[PDB]
């Protein structure tokens, strides 16, 4: 009956409206089976306190899942890792909604642990998406390394590699690196006149004023930046038709908080019906056993899904990460923000306004500048040559 | 648009099983679980069953053990919810329908279908008969008389029933038949006549039915 | 389980307000979604109002929600008009449909209905059976409930009674028929036929000889 489901979530205003939300789904899928609690901390100071607590206080009252938001107040430094830890022995299913940096997206390190949030890796998705129907082909890219520079390159491969085209080279530098102008030069000096970037907001920064001086912008000079590199301080240092970039949502907290619930309501409505379902222990303290109702929970939470909620229709892909997220594509024009279209997902729907690409143009220039480049290379032999 | 479109309403024997076919049209199938909701003559709904957007999860209500069985494919656009071993209490208004989600567990109802009269009773036509019914014990309030003659056991409707060949139309008042658990008609015609006709004049009556093949003159 | 609770009619004119009332007998009326839905007669049914409180797309307001739990109840009110507010309204909670109300529109004025009990015939007795017949006619609305009483109680067994029918003459005519036997009928010091109209009820007894 008490199918106590947790959410670790932010001060008491983020966490009011779970309460709220219980009775509602309390009230949808009513029965004299599914009397759910609500047990809640917010994320309490420094990390392994909080990891305490998590076993002194969730699984101390036998929870079954447990939804994960992002801190309040400071920056992703210190994301909530012993989530995925302390609930990563009994094997049960982690909810996140708004935590996102592509490290959580392997399922190698973390187990098991499903987004509500979608990594930057998609962008590499829609950047397909859009160059596709662009009239160029040929693209160079730019990305820091540290755990995500790989990520977005080697699945901009995943998609470019059905099409038996390549890409031109990926220029990894170590995050946090200036005078970082030596590489320019060398991918100048090669036809393909497009460019992708993507790093942290000091990094972009620095590698940003660091381009003035070569001439880098201006028109066959497009740029491919991510919210990554617009959003934060980065922003007052644009050129004249960058490519922004912004998403739909972003802290709207209690249309996932409600979409979130109603999905594992569904779920867990169809796991009562089920077979055996093992007890929840006392919880850290004593027992170290395997919770063998673990894995089939997440067996229908990464499957099915396909909820009608808020933020729209959900659907979680074979690892986790959900598809079909709306995407509203942005627009730098001379130190101003308009919109191109939405991009629903899976479908490239621009509007017909005005756009401006680098330099002022309003066209599609040519992926590589110019022509006639291609090097003849024989070897002395035969009469032939 | 939204539109579930339901056929194949008829007559089985009680015991036999049947075969139903709700198909669709317009929105997109995937993401909208499929309900079964019926009506009944004389009384209003109640939910049975649903089948999830795919397969898997299916739900039923307290009296839907049994023979009260779902079923849906996905793939060329049909409902398929078929009965077996019917009864006489299954005789109503079915309807295909659909929830508002991919779930049913809500009992969110949107897009009422279309209907369909499933009908499982004792189908034989049954000659009328006809007894005359009395009058009062010579009571008037306004010198009118309440007489008639009672036609029982006919079925399937119509019948025409007129009183001493049809030539008295004044004051009469053929009132629709109602139906029996037997599966046939009954009625009664009365006619309002001065309280002074009662003991001094005969009245009589002739039913009329050509699939019963059936003609009784009665006088009350 | 729990039972609902919905008029059988209500009758108003247009420019008045109509309510209709669904009343949760067991547990809290809040606790489930009442869903509110309108069948209008010979057409698919239609859906008005849920969770309490929703009017669907494309639905031009004027259909409220009434929650209040008050005696464990809840009700729809409808602004004032009669364009096309003929209808039956279904409330649903949870797996579970009310009676169901019928609004009629006002028109001719509404007229006491009569009522005509027929003892059985003696030929039917000889018979071993025993028909008593409730003729009921000339009423509006046209919805009308018929029972019985066996002298002390209500009796339902053998109760027949067709819808009522609308005459040439902007009327409505019912009929009603009790399937008895002959042991019950001579059994008993006298029988009923009770049929309410506008809330005014007409009982009707015979005796037998």
Not at chain 1, 356 to 378: A, C, D, F, H, N
Request: neutral net charge.
């Amino acid at each position: 009956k008490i199918v106590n489901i947790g959410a670790v979530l932010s001060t008491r205003k983020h966490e009011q409206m779970f309460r709220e939300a219980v009775n509602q789904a309390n009230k949808r899928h009513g029965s004299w089976k599914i009397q759910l609690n609500a047990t809640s901390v917010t994320h309490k100071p420094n990390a392994i306190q909080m990891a305490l607590s998590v076993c002194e206080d969730l699984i101390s009252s036998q929870v079954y899942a447990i939804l994960v938001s992002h801190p309040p107040t400071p920056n992703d430094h210190f994301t909530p890792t012993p989530v995925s830890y302390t609930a990563g022995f009994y094997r049960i299913p982690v909810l996140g909604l708004t935590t996102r940096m592509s490290i959580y997206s392997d399922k190698s390190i973390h187990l098991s642990f499903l987004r509500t949030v979608p990594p930057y890796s998609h962008q590499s998705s829609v950047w397909f998406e859009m160059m596709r129907v662009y009239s160029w082909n040929h693209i160079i890219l730019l990305v820091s390394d540290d755990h995500e520079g790989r990520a977005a390159q080697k699945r901009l491969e995943t998609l470019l590699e059905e099409r038996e085209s390549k890409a031109e080279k990926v220029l990894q530098f170590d995050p946090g690196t200036k005078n970082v102008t030596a590489l320019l030069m060398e991918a100048k000096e090669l036809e393909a006149r497009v460019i992708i970037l993507s790093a942290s907001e000091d990094d972009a920064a620095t590698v940003y004023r660091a381009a003035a001086m070569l001439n880098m912008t201006g028109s066959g000079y497009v740029w491919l930046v991510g919210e990554r590199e617009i959003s934060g301080n980065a922003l007052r240092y644009a050129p004249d038709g960058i490519l922004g970039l912004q998403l739909i949502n972003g802290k709207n907290e209690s249309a996932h908080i409600s979409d979130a619930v109603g999905v594992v309501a569904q779920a867990v409505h169809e796991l009562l019906e089920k077979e055996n379902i093992t007890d929840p222990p006392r919880g850290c303290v004593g027992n170290t056993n395997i919770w063998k109702t673990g894995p089939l929970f997440k067996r229908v939470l990464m499957s099915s899904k396909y909820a009608d909620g808020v933020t729209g229709r959900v659907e979680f892909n074979e690892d986790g990460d959900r598809k079909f997220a709306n995407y509203s594509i942005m627009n730098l024009q001379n130190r101003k923000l308009v919109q191109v279209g939405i991009y629903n997902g899976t479908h490239v729907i621009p509007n017909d306004r005005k756009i401006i690409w680098p330099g002022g143009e309003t066209e599609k220039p040519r992926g590589y500048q110019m022509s006639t480049r291609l090097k003849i290379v024989t070897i002395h032999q035969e009469p032939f040559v | 648009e939204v539109q579930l479109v339901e056929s194949g309403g008829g007559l089985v024997q009680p015991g036999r099983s049947l075969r139903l076919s709700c198909a669709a049209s317009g929105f997109t199938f995937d993401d909208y679980a499929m309900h079964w909701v019926r009506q009944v003559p004389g009384k209003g709904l109640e939910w049975v069953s649903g089948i999830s957007w795919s397969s898997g999860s299916i739900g039923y209500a307290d009296s839907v053990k049994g023979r009260f069985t779902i079923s849906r494919d996905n793939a060329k656009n049909s409902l398929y919810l078929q009965m077996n071993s019917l009864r006489a209490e299954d005789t109503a208004l079915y309807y295909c329908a659909k929830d508002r989600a991919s779930s049913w567990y809500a009992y969110g109802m949107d897009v009422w279908g279309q209907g369909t009269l499933v009908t499982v009773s004792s189908a034989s036509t049954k000659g009328p008969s006809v007894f005359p019914l009395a009058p009062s014990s010579k009571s008037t309030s306004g010198g009118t008389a309440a007489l008639g003659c009672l036609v029982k056991d006919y079925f399937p409707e119509p019948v025409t029933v007129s009183w001493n060949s049809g030539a008295l139309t004044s004051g009469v008042h053929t009132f629709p038949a109602v139906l029996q658990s037997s599966g046939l008609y009954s009625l009664s015609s009365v006619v309002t006549v001065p309280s002074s006709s009662l003991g001094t004049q005969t009245y009589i009556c002739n039913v009329n039915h050509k699939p019963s093949n059936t003609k009784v003159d009665k006088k009350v | 389980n729990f039972m609902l609770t919905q008029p059988h009619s209500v009758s108003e004119s247009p420019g008045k307000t109509v309510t209709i009332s669904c009343t949760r007998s067991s547990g809290s009326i809040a606790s489930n979604y009442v869903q509110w839905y309108q069948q209008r007669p010979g057409s698919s049914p239609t859906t008005v109002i849920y969770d309490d409180n929703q009017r669907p797309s494309g639905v031009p307001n004027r259909f409220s929600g009434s929650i209040d739990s008050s005696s464990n109840s809840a009700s729809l009110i409808i602004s004032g008009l009669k364009t096309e507010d003929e209808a039956d309204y279904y409330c649903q909670s949870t797996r579970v449909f009310g009676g169901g109300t019928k609004l009629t529109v006002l028109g001719q004025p509404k007229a006491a209905p009569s009522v005509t009990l027929f003892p059985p015939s003696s030929e039917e007795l000889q018979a071993n059976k025993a028909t008593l017949v409730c003729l009921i006619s000339d009423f509006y609305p046209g919805a009308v409930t018929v029972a019985w009483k066996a002298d002390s109680s209500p009796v339902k067994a053998g109760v027949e009674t067709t819808t009522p029918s609308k005459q040439s003459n902007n009327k409505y005519a019912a009929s009603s028929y009790l399937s008895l036997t002959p042991e019950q009928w001579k059994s008993h010091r006298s029988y009923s036929c009770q049929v309410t109209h506008e809330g005014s009820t007409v009982e009707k007894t015979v005796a037998p000889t």
